[PDB]
Design a protein around this ligand. Sequence first.
Ligand code: HEM
Ligand code: HEM
Ligand SMILES: Cc1ccncc1CCCNCc1ccc2ccc(N)nc2c1
Ligand SMILES: Cc1ccncc1CCCNCc1ccc2ccc(N)nc2c1
Ligand SMILES: C[C@H](O)[C@H](O)[C@H]1CNc2nc(N)[nH]c(=O)c2N1
Ligand SMILES: C[C@H](O)[C@H](O)[C@H]1CNc2nc(N)[nH]c(=O)c2N1
Ligand SMILES: OC[C@@H](O)[C@@H](O)[C@H](O)[C@H](O)CO
Ligand SMILES: OC[C@@H](O)[C@@H](O)[C@H](O)[C@H](O)CO
Ligand SMILES: [Zn+2]
Lengths: 407, 411
Amino acid sequence: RFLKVKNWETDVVLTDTLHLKSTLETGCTEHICMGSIMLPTKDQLFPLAKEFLDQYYSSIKRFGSKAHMDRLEEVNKEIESTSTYQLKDTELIYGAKHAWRNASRCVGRIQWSKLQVFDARDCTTAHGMFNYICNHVKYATNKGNLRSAITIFPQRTDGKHDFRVWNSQLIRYAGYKQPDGSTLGDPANVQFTEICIQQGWKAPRGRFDVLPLLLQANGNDPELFQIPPELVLEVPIRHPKFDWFKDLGLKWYGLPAVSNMLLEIGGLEFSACPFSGWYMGTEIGVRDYCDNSRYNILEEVAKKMDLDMRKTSSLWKDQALVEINIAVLYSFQSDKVTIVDHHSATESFIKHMENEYRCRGGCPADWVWIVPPMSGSITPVFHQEMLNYRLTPSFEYQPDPWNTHVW
Amino acid sequence: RFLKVKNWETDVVLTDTLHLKSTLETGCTEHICMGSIMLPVRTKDQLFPLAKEFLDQYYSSIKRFGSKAHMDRLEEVNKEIESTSTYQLKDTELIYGAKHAWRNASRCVGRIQWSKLQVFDARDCTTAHGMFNYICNHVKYATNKGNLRSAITIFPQRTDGKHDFRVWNSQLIRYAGYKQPDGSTLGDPANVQFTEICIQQGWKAPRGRFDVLPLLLQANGNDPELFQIPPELVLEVPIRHPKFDWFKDLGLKWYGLPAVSNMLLEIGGLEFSACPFSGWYMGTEIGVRDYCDNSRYNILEEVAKKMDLDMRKTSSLWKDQALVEINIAVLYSFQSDKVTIVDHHSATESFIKHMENEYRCRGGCPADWVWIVPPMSGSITPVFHQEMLNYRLTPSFEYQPDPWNTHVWKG
Ligand code: HEM
Ligand code: HEM
Ligand SMILES: Cc1ccncc1CCCNCc1ccc2ccc(N)nc2c1
Ligand SMILES: Cc1ccncc1CCCNCc1ccc2ccc(N)nc2c1
Ligand SMILES: C[C@H](O)[C@H](O)[C@H]1CNc2nc(N)[nH]c(=O)c2N1
Ligand SMILES: C[C@H](O)[C@H](O)[C@H]1CNc2nc(N)[nH]c(=O)c2N1
Ligand SMILES: OC[C@@H](O)[C@@H](O)[C@H](O)[C@H](O)CO
Ligand SMILES: OC[C@@H](O)[C@@H](O)[C@H](O)[C@H](O)CO
Ligand SMILES: [Zn+2]
């Protein structure tokens, strides 16, 4: 019931007690581990509010204070009457920061306390959401000196008045299925792109077209908006040694801004809460560029390098992979856009993990997601045992709005 | 109950029913996943259902379930258990059991080969000298002048737990490690403790960087005895690089035969505490883990210097770059010397095909993603994108405590 994690490279053992606070279910059982699976009322509400308010008030050294008891009383009174309750600004900020802190799949959590929270609960329309999102993008981008931020739209009421950003990220490239059978652009984004077109987006049918925003306010029908091109910082990708690399025509955007997750705080649900940090290089160079179902550029790069691609054992894929990732890091650095390499990031996570065990009694972490998609065991996280469990406040997945939307 | 797994690269969805036959626990609960944790005397009481479960599986597999032979065998085993408190497997049952322990090993990426396993029955062995002879024969058979053949040698099962057969080595062939007074380590740091034990037991150590350790063998619960594997039986491969001529001057080599000797084999409730087995290497085991783990030979820097990479900032990916070149060299050297080896691309590709075949023919394939995904270039191999279900089936290979921690010394 008191759990130990070992690092097999350093022999450092840490003891976890934080897991006992856990409330949500993992998907695993005593008979089966599902660690590698990607997606495993007033009565409901008050214990959740109470649980949250208790940790909030404990965080500010006022547990068992009159202010705590008063707040609990007021929220309770508000739940009985209104069926829901409104978070104080202090509580919302605490909750958002803690959702990030609790994100067991996030390697960048050493940064968790430095998050700019934009309260957009006064938003009523999709043009309003657009304005808030442009402001987030500009603030977060900061001319390449990225700053973590989240923008929080009104909370779910009855489920028929949901605010939703339909895009999976604020900035992402379109995908088009060709008659020649191939895929133009980002294969990941074909279905959403088509939905943009149905709703009226006039597509330029390129390889790197920044998608428009599809914004849904108050459970109303979603509307299209285009982000000002001047607010979308992008980076042409070149290699510090291969002069030919720029001829590949590759580029990526600076700001990773995830917009399809659900933020849960004190039982309240925020279905539209786009957030952003900065990239770890492997997200672009390994996954975006080299996944077979993404831009899948390994073959092309390999050929330009004149590698022996006859046999797997020449490790031509591995060689090309490293070079692509060198170029990504080189390009962002050269243009002064914040990025972190997988070595620095994982090294930071180990130190964060040790802080959290020391100061909080643990750190929920999903090894399958924390270990980078290249060079796993030369990063320190590979050798670090981790316990995965679900704490609240949390970021959750939610269904894509189109499957759900009553048009 | 049906469980689905999805491959996120192909959208292929598989359905698992085999997990229903799982009996043993994982370590996980509905509240916590322990998927990344490395390590999360039996009564006639518990023993007969274990034997019966196993014999039902064996007899089903030979399409003789419910036959007179099946029924008679159950009866024979029950009587043997109640009268002798244990039982003896038939040779056929032993071979089936050893093959299935491998088939069931959720951490093994090489399972496409599971049905091709040479089983050596060493249950008639009584002394450490006898174990040494059996082990030499295994090494020579398995090595096959570089054309490696998978094999397992099985020593007598546990009785009261006081007469255990044990191989004290973690692998039959492994390099010594020596802690120096200045805190540095010579040879393989992973083997320092075992090396000290051997030296204490009387081994005269050459004290080099690649000294093949002696076997330390325990028969019938007696104190272990030292033996040296004939050097002519130990196939080694000097590591060189196909493009970089300076690589040979690093002085690296490795042995051809990975032969794990510290696991426990469980079949039908019986426990085989000494069951050395061997296959062949996947390149990354040597080139990534043995060579580049900080706690092992740790050669990344020296290689990176020799390549003259920019080593002032990690963002140059100098470590990733040297890592690939080292792994190219390992594959190149083994192939050049005609010693069986498999690269991580081929191995993971084969594993996916194996897994899909197992889903169709068996209803599942327990697999530990944490261990199946190779320690370099993870997502450019197909296993990274494959959802897997981990659960425990028997027969199985299990961990057991190191014998020096439990052994009662006779003196
Ligand atoms: C500031 C620099 C940050 C870095 C370097 C970073 C790094 C990462 C990486 C590499 C992943 C894996 C993503 C993938 O493979 O698709 C991830 C996941 C995640 N991050 Fe962070 N992150 C940062 C900031 C943030 C912030 C500000 C938040 C929220 C406020 C956050 C919340 C999450 C969540 C919820 C996941 C899991 C996503 C999922 O399950 O799909 N991250 N992070
Ligand atoms: C024939 C070629 C084989 C290949 C290429 C192969 C590959 C591998 C690899 C790369 C690992 C991970 C090892 C580590 O990281 O420590 C592994 C684990 C394992 N293998 Fe295989 N293997 C082969 C044959 C066998 C055989 C013949 C057996 C048993 C009869 C076996 C049983 C196991 C077991 C039980 C594990 C888990 C070990 C542990 O948990 O420490 N393998 N295999
Ligand atoms: C879960 C799933 C299922 C199907 N397809 C794709 C996915 C991947 C989900 C994408 N998550 C991307 C993400 C989320 C948060 C991030 C935060 C910071 C950062 N640098 N990158 C992030 C990247
Ligand atoms: C259990 C543990 C804990 C910490 N460090 C190390 C370990 C032991 C990991 C050793 N696994 C070795 C192993 C086992 C079976 C194999 C079969 C084939 C093969 N090529 N290699 C294998 C390699
Ligand atoms: C099947 C497996 O769970 C899936 O491929 C996971 C593996 N680890 C990952 N890790 C990260 N960071 N991101 C991912 O999308 C994935 N995908
Ligand atoms: C902590 C973590 O479970 C540990 O480092 C594991 C990770 N995956 C592994 N995978 C393999 N094949 N071999 C290993 O030794 C390990 N070590
Ligand atoms: O084309 C639509 C997809 O990009 C979308 O469904 C995402 O994959 C989904 O939101 C998961 O991130
Ligand atoms: O020096 C002894 C080690 O080799 C030994 O303890 C192994 O790590 C152990 O047997 C697990 O393989
Ligand atoms: Zn689990």
